[PDB]
């Protein structure tokens, strides 16, 4: 004959029951905005790099001091 | 046939693993001539003889309905 | 002043000061609304419950569960969480304390970048920091090198630690945890065919799988056993209502750590992971973590999980090379133990965030900042 | 008659007679079994499955992958492969032709005697050769010295060839493929964190890689336009379901080439690997080789390698001297060009193991016999 | 406890079953819900005239629309599932990715409640709300649906194999119950 309470908290928990409507809006959202930065994890990898070849370790004594021999 | 929707390849997987392991007087057809395939071989009181595949199987389906007659013999004729 | 960490390692949730032996109280990040018309009008209508209270009051409430698979499900939820939690038990002001934030390895930025960012804006917290769950776990367990088990409430680690240092690469991580572990329990469980479905009636669980369960030492042994006997069975009562008894329905569960098949995925288990992740890490520390072996929280409460692994190794190791794990008491609580220890040390005060820093630049700042 | 050769250089695998431009189809070498009980009833079950047909079917089934490290794992699965491939795609017989053999280069002798012993006794077939694949890449590429780069599927590699000539001391040989490369994707993945993990679904990322990925031109210069910029970021679709949009994600996968950090290891990468090959190797020939320096297969696929690729070597060439690089279009189907090639001159007829030799020597005939 | 609204009420077993005949004859699924109760708030043409068995003629409203409402919304008589969609497209994303297009294509209902005209629509349309609409969606509804099983169970019979599968009483002199939970599914 209506529309009423009964149905209007039926709607209400309806909305909380529906699990991926919430958590689809709150996790798919914010995952697209995800990543900003020039990562310290990179600043690692970068710092090994710098360790890990022998062109920059080898050749920057090599190269430089024995130019002048005598 | 009643298995639907799908291939007679199927069954030529079908007849590889069942006969073509077991039953000894159906075969692989070899290669020959005259034909782009052949599927079936085996050994007859004529001789040997080799047969082949379209996908053909639901041609020997046969549906009914009685309504068909049913109504028909209603009919004036 | 004094220095706060919150455990949201998940599950019920711990927090407690700097240098106290134990959290002062724990919940379980429970939340739940109401279901029907309130109908005594003499009632207040609060909306949302959360914690014992709820545990409580839970009949006529519906559950939410905020966190998935260790992933954090709905923020402004969490936010009503996190505010009682201080509030009714802590009673604390977010000034009061540098703050320490308990993580999951690996997973989406997001969480890092809306837990700080709220947490520095809604909250207003002198210093904050994240911390990834091994560490701690080491730290407790005083053993600078390792690898970690700890399937808890949530997402299921593998991490080898080397003393002092990560190993990224080495790492597994997996959605195995005893939540889901437990909803397939009621697929087992309409066998005996005793069947309700709800959030609720799904926590009910959490008391047999207390009480109730027990390791398979061996799986076709134990089955023999099974067409022999019934000690092998136990009676148990509902909560209230029937007193209810279980088969091997109880020792089953378990063996999904090992045969992720009862629910069906392919990751070879935990202790093919664990031998994988090994293989993967490289030749001549094996050994070590052969020795140091390490287990904690949710699943590890079982009795005798650590003697199949010893015997899953055994398999898999070379014989010839010594094998041991470790299962201490206090599994559970190890993580906010570790994090008390984790601030005491002063060297945070060069390292913890500042707010300084969240006036000058992003939530970006974490991802370098912190690991 | 006429002769036939199979690429078993990983990945898709390719076969075709000698003369053909290319081979008739090419499969992948993924075999898969089912997962669940066959409750058709109606079904046929068959237990292992392999090639397109899998590629469709795959979703009960699991996969397993017949090749590790280009080490092929399991011979009695290759088996299966090989006989299906020869008997659906080939039509073919194994007395009808000779077969070439695809091999990585300094790997274990395991692979030569038994791919030789069971070709020879289980298929029975005139002529066997097996071949290293920068003969092939030179033969097709046409420039009789050179050093080759191609990392596959499977391991990759570095070989000077001078012409008519090996220099196997000078020779390098990496597992750093993009199989391996596409796994540690997950770890990055996460970060966005729409994630999964089974073998199907690490197949799903192959797609991104032949449509997504390209090459970072410089690091720090990409970094700052990924602060400045959305068009380093596009749109994406599930294979089906959802769209999926990806940033820097792309472009720092291929950096690991230069970097085996991110999955971290030390090789000093590629480039450097290249020119400490070269500093072995002695000094007047070097110019030719920067005058001619070769690439193909998976990786290369990539837009822009060869560019960073000339960068690199610009930092670490004295810049006096001439450099290029060769980057054809046909790159990924080159070898099993080259080895139709390879199979057209008649010098095989003198050089072709025959089953008379297996007759009366071993295996090991090949080790002297082939390279 | 619809019914007492308009409090033409009676209950016991027969009486019960008693409705399924209005269940066969009034029914049909509701379109909208909101869109429905506009409807009507104007109209009498929801609204249709139906005689006891034997006795009145009875008349009924939105309460024929209103009950099949409850397989999507199981307050009504409350509990949580959240619904026949709902839990299909929850399934679904427990179920692995690739697979997913076929079963948007391969889709089928069947027997007591799909009689209703309308039920596959009104499923469409939430799955066109659940599903990204970029991908292809349909539903089969058969005319035959509540003979459906046994009409597939005739063909389960037909096929030889069972031969090889049936249980028979020799297995049961030589093991009890228990070889069935092994041997079927
Ligand atoms: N007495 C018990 N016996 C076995 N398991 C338990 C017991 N009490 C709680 N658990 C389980 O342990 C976990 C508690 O959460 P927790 O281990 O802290 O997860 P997290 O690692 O995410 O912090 C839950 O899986 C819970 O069901
Ligand atoms: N379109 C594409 N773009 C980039 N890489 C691709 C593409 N298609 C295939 N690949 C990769 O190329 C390799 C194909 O195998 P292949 O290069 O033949 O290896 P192998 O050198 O062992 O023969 C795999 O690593 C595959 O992922």
């Known amino acids: 004959x209506x529309x009423x309470x009964x149905x209007x908290x039926x709607x209400x928990x309806x909305x909380x029951x529906x699990x991926x409507x919430y958590x689809x809006x709150x996790x798919x959202x914010x995952x697209x905005x995800x990543x900003x930065x020039x990562x310290x994890x990179x600043x690692x990898x970068x710092x090994x790099x710098x360790x890990x070849x022998x062109x920059x370790y080898x050749x920057x004594x090599x190269x430089x001091x024995x130019x002048x021999x005598x | 046939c009643m298995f639907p929707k799908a291939t007679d390849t199927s069954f030529k997987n079908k007849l590889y693993e069942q006969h073509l392991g077991k039953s000894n007087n159906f075969q692989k057809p070899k290669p020959a001539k005259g034909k782009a395939e052949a599927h079936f071989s085996l050994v007859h009181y004529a001789g040997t003889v080799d047969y082949n595949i379209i996908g053909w199987l639901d041609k020997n389906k046969d549906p009914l309905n009685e309504t068909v007659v049913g109504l028909y013999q209603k009919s004036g004729l | 002043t004094t220095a706060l960490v919150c455990d949201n390692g998940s599950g019920l949730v711990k927090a407690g000061f700097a240098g106290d032996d134990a959290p002062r109280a724990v919940f379980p990040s429970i939340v739940g609304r109401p279901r029907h018309q309130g109908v005594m009008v003499g009632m207040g209508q609060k909306d949302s419950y959360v914690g014992d209270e709820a545990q409580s009051k839970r009949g006529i409430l519906t559950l939410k569960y905020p966190i998935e698979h260790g992933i954090i499900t709905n923020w402004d939820d969490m936010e009503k969480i996190w505010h009682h939690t201080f509030y009714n038990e802590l009673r604390v002001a977010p000034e009061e304390h540098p703050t320490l934030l308990t993580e999951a390895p690996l997973n989406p930025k997001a969480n890092r970048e809306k837990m700080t960012q709220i947490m520095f804006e809604t909250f207003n917290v002198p210093a904050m920091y994240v911390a990834i769950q091994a560490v701690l776990s080491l730290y407790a367990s005083g053993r600078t090198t390792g690898i970690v088990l700890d399937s808890g409430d949530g997402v299921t680690h593998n991490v080898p630690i080397y003393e002092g240092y990560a190993l990224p ?15 397939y329990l009621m697929k087992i469980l309409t066998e005996r065919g005793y069947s309700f479905v709800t959030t609720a009636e799904r926590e009910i669980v959490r008391d047999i799988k207390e009480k109730l369960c027990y390791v398979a030492l061996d799986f076709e042994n134990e089955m023999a056993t099974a067409a022999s006997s019934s000690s092998l069975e136990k009676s148990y009562e509902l909560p209230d209502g029937q007193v209810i008894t279980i088969g091997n329905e109880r020792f089953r569960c378990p063996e999904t750590l090992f045969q992720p098949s009862f629910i069906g995925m392919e990751s070879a288990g935990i202790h093919e992971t664990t031998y994988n992740s090994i293989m993967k890490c490289d030749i001549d520390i094996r050994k070590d973590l052969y020795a140091n072996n390490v287990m904690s929280g949710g ?39 570790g994090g008390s220890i984790l601030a005491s040390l002063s060297t945070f005060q060069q390292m913890w965030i500042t707010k300084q820093e969240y006036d000058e630049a992003g939530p970006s700042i974490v991802h370098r900042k912190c690991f």
């Open chain 3, 169 to 183: 690469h080495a790492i597994m991580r997996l959605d195995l945890a005893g939540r889901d572990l437990t909803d």
């Open chain 3, 299 to 337: 699943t590890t409460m079982y009795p005798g999980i650590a003697d199949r692994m010893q015997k899953e190794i055994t398999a898999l190791a070379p014989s010839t090379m010594k094998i041991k794990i470790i299962a201490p008491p206090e599994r559970k609580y190890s993580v906010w133990i």
